[PDB]
Scaffold this active site. Structure first.
Site, PDB file in Angstrom:
ATOM      1  N   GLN A   1       0.826  -1.206   0.000  1.00  0.00           N
ATOM      2  CA  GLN A   1       0.000   0.000   0.000  1.00  0.00           C
ATOM      3  C   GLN A   1       0.860   1.256   0.000  1.00  0.00           C
ATOM      4  O   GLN A   1       0.574   2.216  -0.735  1.00  0.00           O
ATOM      5  CB  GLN A   1      -0.934  -0.010   1.210  1.00  0.00           C
ATOM      6  CG  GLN A   1      -1.647   1.305   1.455  1.00  0.00           C
ATOM      7  CD  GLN A   1      -2.356   1.343   2.787  1.00  0.00           C
ATOM      8  OE1 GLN A   1      -2.403   0.348   3.510  1.00  0.00           O
ATOM      9  NE2 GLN A   1      -2.921   2.496   3.120  1.00  0.00           N
TER      10      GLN A   1
ATOM     11  N   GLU B   1      -4.204  -6.925  -1.678  1.00  0.00           N
ATOM     12  CA  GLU B   1      -5.415  -6.485  -1.006  1.00  0.00           C
ATOM     13  C   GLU B   1      -6.070  -5.508  -1.964  1.00  0.00           C
ATOM     14  O   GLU B   1      -5.377  -4.622  -2.482  1.00  0.00           O
ATOM     15  CB  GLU B   1      -5.097  -5.837   0.351  1.00  0.00           C
ATOM     16  CG  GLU B   1      -6.237  -5.162   1.078  1.00  0.00           C
ATOM     17  CD  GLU B   1      -6.285  -3.677   0.838  1.00  0.00           C
ATOM     18  OE1 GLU B   1      -7.394  -3.116   0.888  1.00  0.00           O
ATOM     19  OE2 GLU B   1      -5.220  -3.074   0.592  1.00  0.00           O
TER      20      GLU B   1
ATOM     21  N   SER C   1       7.933  -0.644   1.863  1.00  0.00           N
ATOM     22  CA  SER C   1       8.190  -0.274   3.244  1.00  0.00           C
ATOM     23  C   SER C   1       8.674  -1.492   4.012  1.00  0.00           C
ATOM     24  O   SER C   1       8.307  -2.627   3.703  1.00  0.00           O
ATOM     25  CB  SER C   1       6.932   0.289   3.914  1.00  0.00           C
ATOM     26  OG  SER C   1       5.855  -0.625   3.813  1.00  0.00           O
TER      27      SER C   1
ATOM     28  N   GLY D   1       4.129  -7.102   5.927  1.00  0.00           N
ATOM     29  CA  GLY D   1       3.108  -7.595   5.031  1.00  0.00           C
ATOM     30  C   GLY D   1       3.604  -7.749   3.613  1.00  0.00           C
ATOM     31  O   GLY D   1       4.514  -8.534   3.341  1.00  0.00           O
TER      32      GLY D   1
ATOM     33  N   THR E   1       3.124   2.228  13.484  1.00  0.00           N
ATOM     34  CA  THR E   1       1.713   1.902  13.336  1.00  0.00           C
ATOM     35  C   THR E   1       1.448   0.406  13.434  1.00  0.00           C
ATOM     36  O   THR E   1       0.362  -0.046  13.056  1.00  0.00           O
ATOM     37  CB  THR E   1       1.182   2.441  12.006  1.00  0.00           C
ATOM     38  OG1 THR E   1       1.667   1.627  10.932  1.00  0.00           O
ATOM     39  CG2 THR E   1       1.635   3.878  11.794  1.00  0.00           C
TER      40      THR E   1
ATOM     41  N   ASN F   1       9.316   8.164   7.870  1.00  0.00           N
ATOM     42  CA  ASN F   1       8.091   8.955   7.986  1.00  0.00           C
ATOM     43  C   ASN F   1       8.203  10.025   9.063  1.00  0.00           C
ATOM     44  O   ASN F   1       7.734  11.152   8.874  1.00  0.00           O
ATOM     45  CB  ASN F   1       6.901   8.049   8.295  1.00  0.00           C
ATOM     46  CG  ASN F   1       6.773   6.902   7.327  1.00  0.00           C
ATOM     47  OD1 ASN F   1       6.405   7.087   6.167  1.00  0.00           O
ATOM     48  ND2 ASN F   1       7.062   5.699   7.804  1.00  0.00           N
TER      49      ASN F   1
ATOM     50  N   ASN G   1       4.345  11.539   0.424  1.00  0.00           N
ATOM     51  CA  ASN G   1       4.529  10.937  -0.889  1.00  0.00           C
ATOM     52  C   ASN G   1       4.970  11.966  -1.919  1.00  0.00           C
ATOM     53  O   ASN G   1       5.739  11.640  -2.826  1.00  0.00           O
ATOM     54  CB  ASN G   1       3.239  10.254  -1.330  1.00  0.00           C
ATOM     55  CG  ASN G   1       2.859   9.105  -0.432  1.00  0.00           C
ATOM     56  OD1 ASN G   1       3.483   8.876   0.604  1.00  0.00           O
ATOM     57  ND2 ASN G   1       1.813   8.391  -0.806  1.00  0.00           N
TER      58      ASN G   1
ATOM     59  N   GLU H   1      25.586   4.095 -11.573  1.00  0.00           N
ATOM     60  CA  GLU H   1      26.559   4.792 -10.739  1.00  0.00           C
ATOM     61  C   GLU H   1      26.236   4.721  -9.256  1.00  0.00           C
ATOM     62  O   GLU H   1      27.157   4.784  -8.431  1.00  0.00           O
ATOM     63  CB  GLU H   1      26.653   6.269 -11.128  1.00  0.00           C
ATOM     64  CG  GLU H   1      26.646   6.590 -12.616  1.00  0.00           C
ATOM     65  CD  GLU H   1      27.967   6.354 -13.323  1.00  0.00           C
ATOM     66  OE1 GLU H   1      28.768   5.521 -12.864  1.00  0.00           O
ATOM     67  OE2 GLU H   1      28.202   7.012 -14.358  1.00  0.00           O
TER      68      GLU H   1
HETATM   69  N1  GTP Z   1       5.459   7.634   3.161  1.00  0.00           N
HETATM   70  C1  GTP Z   1       4.375   6.866   3.210  1.00  0.00           C
HETATM   71  N2  GTP Z   1       4.374   5.727   3.988  1.00  0.00           N
HETATM   72  C2  GTP Z   1       3.274   4.939   4.043  1.00  0.00           C
HETATM   73  C3  GTP Z   1       2.140   5.271   3.319  1.00  0.00           C
HETATM   74  N3  GTP Z   1       1.206   4.325   3.555  1.00  0.00           N
HETATM   75  C4  GTP Z   1       1.721   3.408   4.404  1.00  0.00           C
HETATM   76  N4  GTP Z   1       2.998   3.780   4.723  1.00  0.00           N
HETATM   77  C5  GTP Z   1       3.930   3.058   5.607  1.00  0.00           C
HETATM   78  O1  GTP Z   1       3.715   1.662   5.526  1.00  0.00           O
HETATM   79  C6  GTP Z   1       3.946   1.069   6.787  1.00  0.00           C
HETATM   80  C7  GTP Z   1       3.132  -0.208   6.968  1.00  0.00           C
HETATM   81  O2  GTP Z   1       2.919  -0.868   5.739  1.00  0.00           O
HETATM   82  P1  GTP Z   1       1.513  -0.677   4.982  1.00  0.00           P
HETATM   83  O3  GTP Z   1       1.684   0.203   3.770  1.00  0.00           O
HETATM   84  O4  GTP Z   1       0.503  -0.088   5.937  1.00  0.00           O
HETATM   85  O5  GTP Z   1       1.040  -2.150   4.540  1.00  0.00           O
HETATM   86  P2  GTP Z   1       1.755  -2.894   3.310  1.00  0.00           P
HETATM   87  O6  GTP Z   1       3.204  -2.492   3.214  1.00  0.00           O
HETATM   88  O7  GTP Z   1       1.014  -2.562   2.041  1.00  0.00           O
HETATM   89  O8  GTP Z   1       1.613  -4.465   3.621  1.00  0.00           O
HETATM   90  P3  GTP Z   1       0.179  -5.107   3.963  1.00  0.00           P
HETATM   91  O9  GTP Z   1       0.045  -5.280   5.453  1.00  0.00           O
HETATM   92  O10 GTP Z   1       0.062  -6.460   3.306  1.00  0.00           O
HETATM   93  O11 GTP Z   1      -0.908  -4.189   3.463  1.00  0.00           O
HETATM   94  C8  GTP Z   1       3.563   2.130   7.802  1.00  0.00           C
HETATM   95  O12 GTP Z   1       4.442   2.105   8.901  1.00  0.00           O
HETATM   96  C9  GTP Z   1       3.696   3.443   7.058  1.00  0.00           C
HETATM   97  O13 GTP Z   1       4.793   4.171   7.552  1.00  0.00           O
HETATM   98  C10 GTP Z   1       2.135   6.416   2.535  1.00  0.00           C
HETATM   99  O14 GTP Z   1       1.133   6.717   1.890  1.00  0.00           O
HETATM  100  N5  GTP Z   1       3.257   7.213   2.483  1.00  0.00           N
END
Ligand code: GTP
Ligand code: GTP
Ligand code: GDP
Ligand code: MG
EC number: 3.6.5.-
Lengths: 58, 431, 437, 39, 187, 51, 45, 57, 437
Positions: I11, I71, I140, I144, I179, I206, I228, I254
């Protein structure tokens, strides 16, 4: 609850290691004897109850 | 952006603070529903000082309402400008103190100060700067004096560095208004000396003569009495809310007046005062404004600064005027009445100037004095206290509410010591 | 390359900065948004703005100023209104709680949370310069931020910089006029930092500027705006040699080398004195000798002190406009032949003359006349001892009875600094009275 | 309560108050789901 | 440390028989226990480093950092007991160059994955009392192509019962070992 | 907790006071500094230049 | 170096006070702060 | 005395980058604070810096 | 000619790529539906948008991006939003059951049934491109899909393609802001299985972006849209040399040969300057030295880790706009003559710069300003070892009594995998301190 209640004496001889009053030791061979003279489906139940334990027959 | 929280205790405090929120909602353009309908943006420009913002345009007051009976707060809620207050800020009990300081401080006010403290702590952590606290009450009642002083003590225990203001409707020399006023005032002043940063002693009789001679008005009514008090508070607080050529907040006021820590009892004064039909003859000048300040009949306490000696005088000119006229009038009034001024403090007048006069007024002026003449009030209270305590008048109530006589003796000793230091600083010379 | 950074501390400093940056914007033809007016491009390579203003992008000029207060308004008042887009948003730094007319609050409690921020802004503005002439600090002695926080800034500036020249403009308490009671305490406490963290100390009395406004400008109820306009005129006449080209002229180092005899004696008097209204300017010989005599009059000084009771050490005369040097020499000759004005025996040649081509400009809605000749005399004399003595008598009168000391002690300063600062001013008084004779 | 609009809410009140709301909270009219909203 | 000493036949570092046989080692325990007890298999004193989360409970061979166990002997022999638990050890060595590599052998790895500062190799030791023999010379010739010069530090992490840790030059099989270096199991 | 030296959003998103003296809500700063420039609209610029 | 005679307590004798100067316009200031003051002219007795 | 040419001060940074770099803010563990206190100085703290700030002994 | 494939996993990766492709369309003049404007012409000329787009005949541009998340929703707002027509439907790959913040569920479960589909789409894109330069994998370390399936996909790509650069944008979890409660487990495991398959692992945090948005970019209420947008600016500055001509052309090859000394240290922190807001923007000069100093400030770092507790290994400085390489040389010399900024003793040549002529494009409705110069830092340093130390402390506290390990065991993972991963990242810490000493 009492699995990790052993003696952290460092490099010091446990002179009381003949009366066998160490619960942290005793629980370990209780679990080892359970897994040994238990069955095939014994590690799953023991791991379900106590999460730290790992198999002595693997 | 410096916030202050307003507390009202007792009947007098509730009515006076209700009128105070009425006038400072009128000057900020807040309608009784709670929204904003002001003309210029300067009205809401510093609205954060006195109002918290709810969802939408609602601007609730930063006020706490304390009285041991629903009573006066019921009247305030079923009066004009009574719907702006949050219903969670009405803290009340069931019994009600029968003008008993012991009941308001030890028995009935004991099991309500926790709820009041939770409300005050919440409403103060909702702030952003939290300059301080101001409390309206009288030293002649049960829950005005006892519960108010208990609140002051607990709040000074909580936040020991914030500014504390009390508006302290003192007992009057003439008439009575309550027969246990010497006990209530002696027990409340003993708390006010060691727990308040500044105290404006306000007299009903002095306000009566102010409202009935310098304003005619025939039937004065407590609406106009409490509105004179509220105008003095607005003139005190205004440098937080409106810009000016030389602003002065509560801490500047307290630093520039209070010479020694137990000498923070003041006499307020609001000095545009025109009788009905004499505005045509009124000249509306800075010298006339300063003269109406520095007149003994314009004080809101019974004490006479001509009998005493001024220690520190604070004058806040709320409106547009000149530093010429202001500074030269302060210098002239000092140099002419140098007899009523301490010689060991050269030029003992602080000057503040705002820029926004009252709506319907060109200029206003609030007067605060810290003269040594205010020892007369405590002498009156202490002598009536001696006359009652010698024959143990009305003392069985205070002793049956679980409170001893050494409290009375300590309170009287502290008040007599206060009079002693006031007389000492009155008659002390320069060299 | 002649940039100098102006720091404006306190309400007095901020208001003087408003009245001064107005004068700078009109003298360089800049509208109150940073940009030049519509179809009014500079042309001709006029580099006069590259001492108070910086090119950011596409004809925008930012001032080299830091407006400091410990409280909202004034700084907020200039952040919202007219001169809103002129200043950078991060150079008009303001606090939350004011210093409450308390040197202890301004130096110890509230001072040490915003001093590093304004120091970083000063450092950024110094890095934006390609060689800095110095700093111009503006504060009132007064109470609070103008004493305690100005003390903190001068104390940190003197150890950060120090090859630069720090000129500070202090609004001294009047002999009798004051809007506060702890002004003697604050002024005594800031005597030490103005003694040992400044290079020149131009000092002004509100009552004296009031009297000049009442007498010369004919206005009968002046506010702070007229006084601040006169202060702006003085500072503009001081720095106009750096800004504009002209005849023989001084710098901020030429001035100091020709003015101050000793490191402790750096407390001159400023007199910009073709000060008059237009209605009386119809009827005056606005000549160089006349305005030099007007500077040397005892009643046209911005400090309520009689220079006839003292001896002039040195005088730097800054002339502006259609001014040749020969009538300046004639005026200096007449001043020397005047017997009322006395000079110290160890300074025979006691005049430094700097002539600039640019006449001063009047602000609309002001009160000064548009004269073609202007003079600012910057004179080091021993008559400031009267102001020192008045301050010390007031401080002794208050401090005998231990009044208002509990505020300072509770807010954090120890008891002994009062006596230390009183002894420091006594030593400065002894120095001036010794060097006078 | 009733269905929130909030556009009518900060349109029916004073311009200074609405400017303060937009300056301090950019989510009072957060309308990412507005083109996909189908009134 | 251990320089200017005779290192020809054997060099013992840890030996559970003694007064203070952890004086040079550095005791770090976080969720376990180090203790000397009498084993039921050899009937002699044995050190024990038993503890969960084996990456925390460990002992280094030098007591402090910035000091090197200078030992030129290639073979490292350790008498360890199998507890059917996670066992891990590491040795830091200096190559022909100035570089210092690490050989980390553990009973829970599955692939030998050569990396620039670490080897990360698996091991599968038997049940009971094992004698781990670890060549280091063939190993530094095979993993990086360099030659063995000296050791730096030895870490033995957790879940083990140590009797003796020592260095030797050649293999030194059972029938030419000294009596105190033999792993003797009484009935 | 808002930062110490910064303008606030409530302060920034406002109108200035009236510079006309005949207006009631006129400050000294407005009536002295901007009485010539009462209907003033500031003009925002942009940076110029490219690689 | 160090010696037996360095153990003699030499103390610090005495440090002077060097009292304040009290400038010569003190009488002029005392005269001029009271050349204008009167007693109860505006407020009255 | 500091304007005197035989007084060079090795501290007192020539650059703003060095001015923030000589501060006390710890980016790994200082929680969501602002520009006022991300550049707090040891002179402001009152540490044992070898700088003479006032003439008073 | 040269082509890059962007894979956005999770996500966080999908939302990041949404911002990135919005910025790419704005700076290449492509409307959100996919077409270029008819009356307006923005693209062409100074553009190499074929490195990130494909021309399908009639005039539509299709990005070389694969949006993957297990998802449905976060892929369906892309599928039904403003950019619904921009992406080819088989690029936006979605699953049925969520990975549920579980590395085991992202590695040994449902993602194993979709790795073949995403690999086939990657194969089709690589067959389409006329010579592949590398992959940009945005995800990230939180857990997940971002820690799980992304690592599995990188392992499969390393097995299949080989010898190609796989640059990885990693949203690293903050030291205190989090989170989720299994973030240490997920980050430990994804570091273990990414440490041998990522050529570069550009770290972004973040909480540090929250700090940047609060301090530098005004905004009292930062959110994921602003985060973002800032990350999109970073990656636009990274990839702008592939799409615009420049003085020092730096491509994706590079970044691994100038920032990775040993094949274990490939975690450079990102830093962007200026990140000034539009209110100040044009009240500052924003010169090359100013943006480089603000880029080198420890407060302006986009990973919550100050560089003062470590020595710099390497620094990639990507300059963009009207930047002159002599100005860049003077700035780099100015930092190199500072002793508070420490470099390792084995790397005298610690800088690699890339000059680009195209200034960054402002996003309408965004929060940044229209600026000419912009510097982007990719700094590899011996300072993130303290972040690994804190994260092993978190893992140790979690794993001391086997909290949450039953989920990972029940959906595929063996018990010893956690200890293998902890052992390897402790070895990574030892590698960091060995290089630093
Ligand atoms: N910079 C930024 N970080 C995000 C954003 N959305 C989620 N994150 C980061 O993603 C981390 C957790 O992963 P998620 O994106 O919520 O879930 P996922 O990586 O898609 O994995 P799943 O659990 O399967 O959905 C959080 O700690 C956030 O810091 C975003 O829109 N911008
Ligand atoms: N000439 C002139 N003097 C001013 C002006 N404003 C204030 N002052 C002087 O400043 C004194 C009042 O104290 P302030 O300088 O305002 O105090 P501050 O520096 O703002 O610091 P605080 O105590 O926190 O208010 C007065 O006695 C005036 O002499 C001004 O606008 N012009
Ligand atoms: N000015 C003014 N004084 C009041 C008002 N109500 C009560 N008082 C004064 O308060 C005193 C009595 O105190 P009271 O209100 O009964 O205190 P309580 O019993 O604790 O609530 C009397 O001396 C009154 O003069 C009012 O509305 N205005
Ligand atoms: Mg002030």
């Amino acid at each position: 609850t009492f699995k990790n209640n052993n003696l952290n004496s460092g490099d010091s001889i446990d002179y009381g290691q003949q009366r066998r009053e160490n619960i942290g030791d005793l629980i370990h061979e209780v679990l080892v004897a359970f897994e040994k003279k238990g069955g095939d489906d014994a590690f799953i139940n023991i791991k379900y109850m106590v999460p730290t334990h790992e198999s002595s027959v693997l | 952006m410096r916030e202050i929280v307003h507390m009202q205790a007792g009947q007098c405090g509730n009515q006076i603070g209700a009128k105070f929120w009425e006038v400072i909602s009128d000057e900020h353009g807040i309608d009784p529903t709670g929204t904003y309908h002001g003309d210029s943006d300067l009205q809401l420009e510093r609205i954060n000082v006195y109002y918290n913002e709810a969802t939408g345009g609602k601007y609730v007051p930063r006020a706490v309402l304390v009285d041991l009976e629903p009573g006066t707060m019921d009247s305030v809620r079923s009066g004009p400008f009574g719907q702006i207050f949050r219903p969670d800020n009405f803290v009340f009990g069931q019994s009600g103190a029968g003008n008993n300081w012991a009941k308001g401080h030890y028995t009935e006010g004991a099991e309500l100060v926790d709820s009041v403290l939770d409300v005050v702590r919440k409403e103060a952590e909702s702030c952003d700067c939290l300059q301080g606290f101001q409390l309206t009450h009288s030293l002649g009642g049960g829950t005005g004096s006892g519960m108010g002083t208990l609140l002051i003590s607990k709040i000074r225990e909580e936040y020991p560095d914030r500014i504390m203001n009390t508006f302290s409707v003192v007992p009057s020399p003439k008439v009575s208004d309550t027969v246990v006023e010497p006990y209530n005032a002696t027990l409340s002043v003993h708390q006010l000396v060691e727990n308040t940063d500044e105290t404006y002693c306000i007299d009903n009789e002095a306000l009566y003569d102010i409202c009935f001679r310098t304003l005619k008005l025939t039937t004065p009514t407590y609406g106009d009495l409490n509105h004179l008090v509220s105008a003095t508070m607005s003139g005190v607080t205004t440098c937080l809310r409106f810009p000016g050529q030389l602003n002065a907040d509560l801490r500047k006021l307290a630093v520039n007046m209070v010479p020694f820590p137990r000498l923070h009892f003041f006499m307020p004064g609001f000095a545009p005062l025109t009788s009905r039909g004499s505005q045509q003859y009124r000249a509306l000048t800075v010298p006339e404004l300063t003269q109406q300040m520095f007149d003994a009949k314009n004080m809101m306490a019974a004490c006479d600064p001509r009998h005493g000696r001024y220690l520190t005088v604070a004058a806040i000119f709320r409106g547009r005027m000149s530093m010429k006229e202001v500074d030269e009038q302060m210098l002239n009034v000092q140099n002419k009445n140098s007899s009523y001024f301490v010689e060991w403090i050269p030029n003992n007048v602080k000057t503040a100037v705002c820029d926004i006069p009252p709506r319907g007024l060109k200029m206003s002026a609030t007067f605060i004095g810290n003269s040594t003449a205010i020892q007369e009030l405590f002498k009156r209270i202490s002598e009536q206290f001696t006359a009652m305590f010698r024959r143990k008048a009305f003392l069985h109530w205070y002793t049956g509410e679980g409170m001893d006589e050494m409290e009375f003796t300590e309170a009287e000793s502290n008040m007599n010591d206060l009079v002693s230091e006031y007389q000492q600083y009155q008659d002390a010379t320069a060299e | 390359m002649r940039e100098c950074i102006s720091i404006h501390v306190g309400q007095a400093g901020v208001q003087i900065g408003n009245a001064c940056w107005e004068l700078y914007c009109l003298e360089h033809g800049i509208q109150p948004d940073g940009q030049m007016p519509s179809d009014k491009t500079i042309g001709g390579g006029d580099d006069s703005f590259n001492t108070f203003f910086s090119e950011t992008g596409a004809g925008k000029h930012v001032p080299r100023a830091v407006f400091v207060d410990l409280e909202p308004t004034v700084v907020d008042e200039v952040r919202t209104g007219t001169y809103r887009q002129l200043f950078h948003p991060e150079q008009l730094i303001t606090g939350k709680e004011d210093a409450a007319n308390n040197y202890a609050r301004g130096h110890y409690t509230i001072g040490k949370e915003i001093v590093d921020l304004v120091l970083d802004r000063i450092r950024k503005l110094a890095d934006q310069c390609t060689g800095l002439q110095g700093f111009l600090i503006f504060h009132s002695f007064g109470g609070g931020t103008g004493s305690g926080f100005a003390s903190l800034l001068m104390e940190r500036l003197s150890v950060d910089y120090g090859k630069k020249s720090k000129l500070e403009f202090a609004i001294y308490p009047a002999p009798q006029i004051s809007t506060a009671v702890v002004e003697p305490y604050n002024t005594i406490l800031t005597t030490h930092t103005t003694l040992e963290h400044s290079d020149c100390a131009f000092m002004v009395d509100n009552e004296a500027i009031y009297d000049i406004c009442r007498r010369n400008l004919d206005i009968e109820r002046p506010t702070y705006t007229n006084l601040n306009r006169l202060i702006a005129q003085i500072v503009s006449s001081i720095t106009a040699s750096l800004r504009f080209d002209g005849a023989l002229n001084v710098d901020l180092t030429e001035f100091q080398t020709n003015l101050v005899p000793y490191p402790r004696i750096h407390f001159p008097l400023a007199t910009y004195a073709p000060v008059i209204s237009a209605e009386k300017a119809y009827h005056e010989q606005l000549s160089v000798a006349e305005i030099t005599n007007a500077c040397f009059e005892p009643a046209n000084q911005m400090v309520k002190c009689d220079p006839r009771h003292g001896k002039y050490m040195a005088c730097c005369m800054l002339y502006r406009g259609d001014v040749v040097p020969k009538d300046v020499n004639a005026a200096i000759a007449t001043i020397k032949t005047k017997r009322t004005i006395q000079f110290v025996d160890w300074c025979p040649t006691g005049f430094k003359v700097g002539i600039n081509y640019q006449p001063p400009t009047v602000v609309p809605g002001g009160d000064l006349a548009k004269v073609q000749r202007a003079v600012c005399m910057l004179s080091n004399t021993t008559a400031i001892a009267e102001a020192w003595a008045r301050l010390d008598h007031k401080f002794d009168l208050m401090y005998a009875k231990r009044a208002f000391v509990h505020w300072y002690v509770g807010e954090g300063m120890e008891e002994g600094e009062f006596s230390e600062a009183r002894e420091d001013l006594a030593a400065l008084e002894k120095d001036y009275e010794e060097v006078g004779v | 309560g009733p269905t929130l609009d909030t556009t009518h809410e900060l349109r029916s009140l004073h311009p200074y108050v609405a400017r303060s709301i937009k300056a301090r909270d950019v989510f009072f009219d957060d309308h990412t789901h507005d083109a996909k909203k189908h009134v | 440390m251990f320089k200017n000493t005779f290192q020809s036949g054997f060099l013992s570092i840890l030996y559970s028989i003694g007064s203070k046989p952890l004086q040079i080692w550095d005791k770090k325990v976080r969720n376990g226990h180090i203790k000397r007890i009498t084993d039921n298999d050899i009937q002699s004193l044995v050190l024990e480093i038993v503890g969960t989360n084996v990456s925390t409970t460990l002992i280094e061979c030098p007591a402090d950092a910035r000091k090197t166990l200078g030992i030129k002997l290639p073979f490292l022999v350790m008498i360890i007991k199998n507890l059917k638990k996670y066992f891990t050890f590491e040795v830091q060595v200096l190559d022909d160059k100035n570089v210092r590599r690490r050989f980390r052998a553990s009973n829970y790895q599955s692939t030998t994955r050569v990396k620039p500062f670490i080897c990360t190799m698996p091991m599968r030791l038997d049940d009971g009392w094992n004698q781990i023999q670890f060549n280091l010379s063939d190993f530094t010739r095979r993993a990086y192509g360099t030659n063995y010069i000296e050791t730096i530090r030895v870490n033995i992490h957790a879940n083990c019962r140590i009797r003796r840790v020592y260095f030797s030059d050649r293999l030194y099989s059972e029938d030419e070992l000294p009596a105190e270096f033999k792993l003797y199991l009484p009935i | 907790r808002l930062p110490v030296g910064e303008p606030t959003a409530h302060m920034s998103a406002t109108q200035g006071p009236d510079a006309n003296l005949m207006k009631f809500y006129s400050t000294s700063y407005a009536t002295s500094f901007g009485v010539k420039h009462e209907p003033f609209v500031p003009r925002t610029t942009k940076h110029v230049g490219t690689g | 170096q160090e010696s037996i005679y360095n153990l003699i307590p030499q103390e610090e004798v005495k440090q002077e006070k060097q009292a304040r100067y009290t400038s010569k316009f003190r009488g002029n200031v005392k005269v001029e702060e009271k050349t204008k003051k009167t007693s109860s002219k505006t407020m009255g007795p | 005395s500091r304007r005197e040419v035989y007084h060079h001060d090795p501290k007192a940074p020539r650059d703003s980058l060095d001015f923030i770099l000589k501060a006390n803010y710890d980016h790994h563990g200082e929680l969501l604070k602002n520009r006022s206190e991300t550049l707090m100085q040891p002179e402001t703290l009152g540490a044992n810096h070898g700088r003479i700030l006032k003439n008073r002994v």
